[PDB]
Amino acid sequence: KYSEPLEEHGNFLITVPGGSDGPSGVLICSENYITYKNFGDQPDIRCPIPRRRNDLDDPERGMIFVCSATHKTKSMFFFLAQTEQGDIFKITLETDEDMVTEIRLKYFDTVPVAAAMCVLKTGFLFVASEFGNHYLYQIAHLGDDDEEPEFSSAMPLEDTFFFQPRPLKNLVLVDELDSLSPILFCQIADLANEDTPQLYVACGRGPRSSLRVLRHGLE
Amino acid sequence: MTDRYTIHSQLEHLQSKYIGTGHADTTKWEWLVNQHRDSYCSYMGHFDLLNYFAIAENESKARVRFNLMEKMLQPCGPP
Amino acid sequence: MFLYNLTLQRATGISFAIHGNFSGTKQQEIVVSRGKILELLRPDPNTGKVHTLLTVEVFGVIRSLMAFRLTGGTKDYIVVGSDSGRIVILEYQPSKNMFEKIHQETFGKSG
Amino acid sequence: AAFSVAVCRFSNTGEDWYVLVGVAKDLILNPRSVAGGFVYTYKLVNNGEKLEFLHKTPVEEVPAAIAPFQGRVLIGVGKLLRVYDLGKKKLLRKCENKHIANYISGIQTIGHRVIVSDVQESFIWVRYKRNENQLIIFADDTYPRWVTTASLLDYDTVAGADKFGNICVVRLPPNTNDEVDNGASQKAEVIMNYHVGETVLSLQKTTLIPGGSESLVYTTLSGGIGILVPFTSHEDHDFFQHVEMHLRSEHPPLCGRDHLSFRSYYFPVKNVIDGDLCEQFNSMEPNKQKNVSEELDRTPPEVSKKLEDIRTRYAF
Amino acid sequence: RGAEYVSAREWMRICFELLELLKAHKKAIRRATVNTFGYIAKAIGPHDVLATLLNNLKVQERQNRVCTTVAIAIVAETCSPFTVLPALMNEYRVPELNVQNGVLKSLSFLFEYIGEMGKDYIYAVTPLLEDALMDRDLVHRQTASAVVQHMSLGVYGFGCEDSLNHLLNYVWPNVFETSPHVIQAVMGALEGLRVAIGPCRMLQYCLQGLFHPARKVRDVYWKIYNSIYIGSQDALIAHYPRIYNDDKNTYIRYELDYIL
Amino acid sequence: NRFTVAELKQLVARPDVVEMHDVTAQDPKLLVHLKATRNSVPVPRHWCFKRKYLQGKRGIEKPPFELPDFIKRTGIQEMREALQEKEEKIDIDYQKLHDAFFKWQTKPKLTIHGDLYYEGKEFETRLKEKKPGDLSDELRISLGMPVPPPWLIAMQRYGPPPSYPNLKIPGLNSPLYGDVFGT
Amino acid sequence: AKHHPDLIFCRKQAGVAIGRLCEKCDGKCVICDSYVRPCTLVRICDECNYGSYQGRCVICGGPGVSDAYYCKECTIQEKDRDGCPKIVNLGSSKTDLFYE
Amino acid sequence: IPYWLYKLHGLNINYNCEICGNYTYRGPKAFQRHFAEWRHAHGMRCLGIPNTAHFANVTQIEDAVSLWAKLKLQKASERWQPDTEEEYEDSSGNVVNKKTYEDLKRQG
Amino acid sequence: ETIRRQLELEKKKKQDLDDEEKTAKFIEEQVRR
Amino acid sequence: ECLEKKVDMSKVNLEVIKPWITKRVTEILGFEDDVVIEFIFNQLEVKNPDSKMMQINLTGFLNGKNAREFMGELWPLLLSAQENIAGIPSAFLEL
Amino acid sequence: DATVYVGGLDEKVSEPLLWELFLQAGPVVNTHMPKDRVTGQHQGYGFVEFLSEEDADYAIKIMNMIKLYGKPIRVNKA
Amino acid sequence: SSESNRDRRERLRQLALETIDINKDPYFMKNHLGSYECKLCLTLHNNEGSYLAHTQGKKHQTNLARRAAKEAKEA
RNA sequence: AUGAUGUCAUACUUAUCCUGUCCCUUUU
RNA sequence: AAGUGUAGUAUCUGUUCUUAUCAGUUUAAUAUCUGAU
């Protein structure tokens, strides 16, 4: 039906819900960019990915959308997207009468390296990481009514909007699904003084290190 | 445009339509490119293989996915 | 050396994830897809505890997981993309607590 | 950047259990890095609670292994096996072997032989004559495997994982010419083959629940710990085989994959009974249970008891 | 159904009469004759039926001639193959090329019909197949390749790797051949071996032929490689060896060398 | 255009597997890199032959079939010969055949993965390593010696053998066991 | 086929249709060309059955009676997951037989 | 005059064997036999070129020396000579060759 | 003929059951220690 | 060849090239034919046509030399029209 | 000098047995025991061309004492 | 017919063996695949006729006269 | 002392195959 | 003293290259073939 080149290669796509709820279109994330280029005569709206203010990371290293979820509501619709640094940003699609007005981004919270995100009903956010225990937070703040700024696609820059990260202000950790993942090594022996041998299993990824001394029982 | 090169089909021969089926006049660059592409696709397929390959670097799963999808075009070199 | 495979602890890592009312009721379920096992979770709304409602070994390489909800329905299907060339659309069966294969269609070869 | 570590005593030294840790400088994921290698000689004294890297012998390529052998330190410098002796300045390379193919990925020290697992090649058993101080490749493997871990099963049996998600067990034959002086002369057979499903990286099967039979505990990169145990009865093996053959058609998977294909993805299956598919008899439907009991000539509770017996005898 | 009112001598006479019914110009008649021979074998016993079938001098090689071999396989599937195996092995000692080819075809059909039951007869069927692999006649090699295909399809997962390798040792030289029947049988046997013996050994045996100089050798090796690559598309990653990197090409998959 | 065979052998890492027909190939470097694999199987000797790989056994008078002991000890051959003699029934046993096919089943001598069947492959009775002092029992039997050999004393008078400098003889140099008479 | 090597299989994309085989070719394997050990069912192509092309025999090409299935030898060999095995060609067989 | 046999069997094919004493061979199989024969054997022996696989089908007398040199222990025949145990330092000095080890064992 | 192996199979099954009972008793005695 | 450059028939008119192509066909083909004119007109109907298929069709209808002439007459005129900001060549303005 | 003849044996001796017997003393490079095609029996005499003259002389001097098929197996230069 | 065919084949084999014995030909040899081979002609023969027909063409007796003269120099 | 050539006979294999139709051409 | 047809394979019988060279196609290389002395 349609073919549309882009400026640079992309990494992920997210379908903006259309019909009676929201407009049609597909927001494509790419290296240090997020572009909303819907169908028809709608124009392309761009928004660069923020970065941490005075971040010690490498400048040559870009940023890509690791994963994204959408909270579809009858009133409006927002998206929660995790970056390579785990900073979960809140994308809002400023829509005109019949076209896209601008892409409103805001620092939602700081989350781990996110492999998947599901925004369920009753204000719950299940964030599963590529390594380490899972996470299930309680969506308390809706992203607004705070002192955090909203970077919009209409806001020019030349230069990227530096991000002011902070702890979990809009989410509360309700539980943590252990799920001991990458077991780099293992030693099954009676390292303790007991007869029931313990399984010393190391798993993690850098800061997520954990030397779990597994024991066959129930806590 | 006097070329006279109408390579479509002759008598319904074998004509390997599979991607990477292999042939007789396959140069070393062709076999190497097919092998590299198949290996990249396999690394993109196996979840545990992706975890073991990306667990080396500090990059995330999406980092490895993008680096693999980017290396698909011209992995070996321009023949 | 005729060995016998015994899985003591299933895989806890999550490779794919979907969220929807797959149970057919007002409760919202979370379908997680590990490397070689699928799971359905129904965490406590009030207690906030995540209980493994169901866990089934897929016996395959789950490569993609996308949900489905027909027009005018109240129960979501489960599209299971595997390494085999068989597209599978399963449906929950809480009355029996088993994943029912609603449809299965072959597409191509294996691997 | 570290790659391997170990702790052992030196023959020339007394009870000073030295901690040898190998690391590499200027390394890279791309195929264009080596720079140099260093083997810091940790002291680890003060009632085993005080490390001290006195010696710092530099390596050649990228070190990835260190083990003891006859009191000396067998280390892997790329495609070289160096049996060094703990000296004053650096580990004096008392013997060298240059028969390695690609890179020393694993080194298992047997009482007299040594199992070297390469990155691209399969395991190779090499005998180290101490009188002449010479290592000689005793045999090799037929099919290759990207070995990530290894375990010494017996005096001639060695088990090894695969980077492609496989677990194999190679047993040397009785006719292995331990005394020596397509690729190599002596070859070995594959005695075990089974698709683990997830990339395994650790295998030290020993004794789990005290009072039970020892087994091979295997880990997985996706967070799974399984246990492989042997069938101590030919009748039990036949019963398990009939159960698997019935379950392959009675309660197949939902993903449409075949058990023979799900188990033989990278390499074929070789004497491995998938107990995970066998566990579905408890969850199988009643008609399926009755059909299985008829095909097996036993009761469905009989099959349940037979399945629970293995879990009780070989596991916790 | 009944198999009771028919007497032993009555069953023998019925078999001697049905032996002549195989000369018809129909296929359904032959299928029904094979089924009836199998029923009579299940009723009376294996010895007399196998003895009556072994006398097939095969006047014509067509007109349901192999049908005797199909009936032998049906009797082996209905009766104990422990009884039908050595009698067939002894009947294979005859000098006639017709009888030898018939024994080979019957063994192939019996292995194919048995399938999982062949987990024990592999070591017993190995040496006869290895001896017949010697290409004294094209029909012998064709029957050999067919038996190898049936055995590889039937021995899937039963643990017959040694017999598979021993059969491949003699089946590999059959790749060079111009016979259409022989070529088709060799291709089917290669497919079966890749199914059972595994694609790793198949590629290890077909590796050197890929970049060969000749036209015919390169063609045969490329056909074998295309057959091995049609399936097992996922397992071809590991079997792909490490080829050194040239100047303007980096073919070595360095990511595979990533040591965790 | 075409590289020299000597040049390809000098540039090759394992030139012991070089062939004369490889110089006119399309990618000789790739062929050399492939032929020096670990478990690589070569092409057969029919690449240059002209007998169709089956026209060799012209006059070889071969036997009908060498059945195994598992079948030979079952008595089917004798019964078949008796039936042929009477024609040109027995009911010997069935549990005996069951034990023969299940219990008395022998694992024959298989072949290695690279066992390519050559043209003749019959007159090539090779030996692994017949070191000095290790031979067949037939030699000592024909010699009729009891349970070192008579030839080890000659090395004392004449001196150690020239071709085997690493030989260690029994009694004098190596302080014999069984039929083995060397080390 | 082994009986008709000059035949051309359809190799079309698979559909949701179940095929049938002619009574004369009842039980014959579609691919393996065997007569025992069936594993999977035969799927027809979308264009392979539309009106007059509906209800025809897969191999025989005639009016079908029984539902066919793939041979287990073809299923274990990863052969049953191929394209539409409809015999589109009809040559070198039953050509001059009408003249006789 | 079986010229059919002469053309089919590979006869009437000239070949020069410098390794086989600069001899002539009227066929390709004849060339393979002349490269590996008693005449070529004596030629390589008097020339100092021992028999081997890669040194079998060689013709030029120059490349044979290069093959014999590169194959003359490409990377081998080095067991170990760091064993000295230079106890003069005993904490950071212990580097000396095996020849120096024997020299210290003999002299001091 | 199969009935003979069936009787022998049942005898072997009873023997294996007795051996498993003895092994379980021994393991229980060890666990008591 | 001149037909190797990518063109776009959407960015140019069609009535300006109709009678020129008709006259070229009447001169090369000699007689008056409607199948050739309609085929040439429908050939340039797509938004991103291909000159190779058009040349093949012209060679099939024409002799092959006249086909080359027609290709080399239609390619550059269409290219110049697509290059014109108004969308026509220099001949459409002359008369 | 490298070639030698060895006789004094019965039909019990053959090619590979004689080769294995020679290899006990020195490596038999190329042995040949011409068997008469008419009767199909061992002539009791063979010719062995060793690797060089050293092993040939060594076997002729020291190895000329074995006895195949009971009779003495001498060795002589050739 | 079929049994008559086997009887005719047996009678033909008997007649061929009788002819070979009357001629005292050494070349005719029965193969392990139920065939005949002429070692003198160094050829094969499917039926008995092809084996008995190795006397009109390929007169290798002249080529055997060479070996006859090589074994004995005297005429 | 292998082979190439091709009228003319011969054995073999494909579990090859005997009621197959104009149910579809109805153009002037 | 009975077999019908559809495709393919081998073993049998009869014939031919002492042509010295050059170039090309083709061959793994020969061979064969194509033009000149």
PDB file of C-alpha atoms in Angstrom, chain G residues 31-93:
ATOM      1  CA  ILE G  31       4.864 -38.211  -1.282  1.00  0.00           C
ATOM      2  CA  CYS G  32       6.557 -41.375  -0.021  1.00  0.00           C
ATOM      3  CA  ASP G  33       4.591 -43.493  -2.530  1.00  0.00           C
ATOM      4  CA  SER G  34       4.458 -46.235   0.130  1.00  0.00           C
ATOM      5  CA  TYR G  35       1.486 -48.248   1.405  1.00  0.00           C
ATOM      6  CA  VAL G  36       1.954 -48.290   5.211  1.00  0.00           C
ATOM      7  CA  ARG G  37       2.780 -46.098   8.209  1.00  0.00           C
ATOM      8  CA  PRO G  38       0.878 -42.804   7.752  1.00  0.00           C
ATOM      9  CA  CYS G  39       1.589 -39.931  10.146  1.00  0.00           C
ATOM     10  CA  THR G  40      -0.047 -36.638   9.097  1.00  0.00           C
ATOM     11  CA  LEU G  41      -2.986 -35.472   7.005  1.00  0.00           C
ATOM     12  CA  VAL G  42      -2.684 -34.002   3.509  1.00  0.00           C
ATOM     13  CA  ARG G  43      -3.439 -30.293   3.058  1.00  0.00           C
ATOM     14  CA  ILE G  44      -4.606 -28.998  -0.323  1.00  0.00           C
ATOM     15  CA  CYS G  45      -3.741 -25.673  -1.924  1.00  0.00           C
ATOM     16  CA  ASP G  46      -6.139 -22.739  -2.003  1.00  0.00           C
ATOM     17  CA  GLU G  47      -6.278 -22.659  -5.807  1.00  0.00           C
ATOM     18  CA  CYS G  48      -5.949 -26.463  -5.931  1.00  0.00           C
ATOM     19  CA  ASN G  49      -9.665 -26.867  -5.047  1.00  0.00           C
ATOM     20  CA  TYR G  50     -12.197 -24.389  -6.470  1.00  0.00           C
ATOM     21  CA  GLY G  51     -15.348 -25.909  -7.941  1.00  0.00           C
ATOM     22  CA  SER G  52     -14.488 -28.447 -10.632  1.00  0.00           C
ATOM     23  CA  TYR G  53     -11.023 -28.765  -9.075  1.00  0.00           C
ATOM     24  CA  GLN G  54     -12.744 -29.619  -5.765  1.00  0.00           C
ATOM     25  CA  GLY G  55     -13.044 -33.267  -4.799  1.00  0.00           C
ATOM     26  CA  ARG G  56     -10.420 -34.516  -7.256  1.00  0.00           C
ATOM     27  CA  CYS G  57      -7.765 -37.071  -6.367  1.00  0.00           C
ATOM     28  CA  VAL G  58      -4.367 -35.814  -5.239  1.00  0.00           C
ATOM     29  CA  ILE G  59      -2.217 -38.440  -6.974  1.00  0.00           C
ATOM     30  CA  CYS G  60      -4.766 -40.312  -9.089  1.00  0.00           C
ATOM     31  CA  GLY G  61      -6.382 -37.077 -10.271  1.00  0.00           C
ATOM     32  CA  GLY G  62      -9.799 -38.749 -10.313  1.00  0.00           C
ATOM     33  CA  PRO G  63     -12.852 -38.421  -8.059  1.00  0.00           C
ATOM     34  CA  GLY G  64     -11.820 -38.941  -4.456  1.00  0.00           C
ATOM     35  CA  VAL G  65     -13.523 -41.142  -1.875  1.00  0.00           C
ATOM     36  CA  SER G  66     -11.228 -41.541   1.141  1.00  0.00           C
ATOM     37  CA  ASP G  67      -9.202 -38.875   2.927  1.00  0.00           C
ATOM     38  CA  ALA G  68      -5.470 -39.214   2.294  1.00  0.00           C
ATOM     39  CA  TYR G  69      -2.550 -38.762   4.676  1.00  0.00           C
ATOM     40  CA  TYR G  70       1.195 -38.241   4.464  1.00  0.00           C
ATOM     41  CA  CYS G  71       3.533 -41.176   4.994  1.00  0.00           C
ATOM     42  CA  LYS G  72       5.401 -41.352   8.296  1.00  0.00           C
ATOM     43  CA  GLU G  73       8.661 -41.715   6.372  1.00  0.00           C
ATOM     44  CA  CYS G  74       7.792 -38.396   4.712  1.00  0.00           C
ATOM     45  CA  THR G  75       6.765 -36.801   8.021  1.00  0.00           C
ATOM     46  CA  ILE G  76       9.880 -37.745   9.992  1.00  0.00           C
ATOM     47  CA  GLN G  77      12.105 -36.581   7.114  1.00  0.00           C
ATOM     48  CA  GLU G  78      10.630 -33.040   7.250  1.00  0.00           C
ATOM     49  CA  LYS G  79       9.017 -33.706   3.851  1.00  0.00           C
ATOM     50  CA  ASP G  80       5.338 -33.327   4.800  1.00  0.00           C
ATOM     51  CA  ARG G  81       5.781 -29.599   5.555  1.00  0.00           C
ATOM     52  CA  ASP G  82       6.336 -28.782   1.861  1.00  0.00           C
ATOM     53  CA  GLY G  83       4.055 -27.004  -0.600  1.00  0.00           C
ATOM     54  CA  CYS G  84       0.811 -28.175  -2.159  1.00  0.00           C
ATOM     55  CA  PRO G  85       1.522 -31.724  -3.529  1.00  0.00           C
ATOM     56  CA  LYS G  86      -1.130 -31.539  -6.257  1.00  0.00           C
ATOM     57  CA  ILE G  87      -0.221 -33.325  -9.488  1.00  0.00           C
ATOM     58  CA  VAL G  88      -0.688 -30.447 -11.923  1.00  0.00           C
ATOM     59  CA  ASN G  89       0.943 -32.287 -14.830  1.00  0.00           C
ATOM     60  CA  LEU G  90      -0.493 -35.325 -16.613  1.00  0.00           C
ATOM     61  CA  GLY G  91       1.973 -36.872 -19.044  1.00  0.00           C
ATOM     62  CA  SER G  92       3.907 -40.065 -19.737  1.00  0.00           C
ATOM     63  CA  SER G  93       0.994 -41.965 -18.163  1.00  0.00           C
TER      64      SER G  93
END
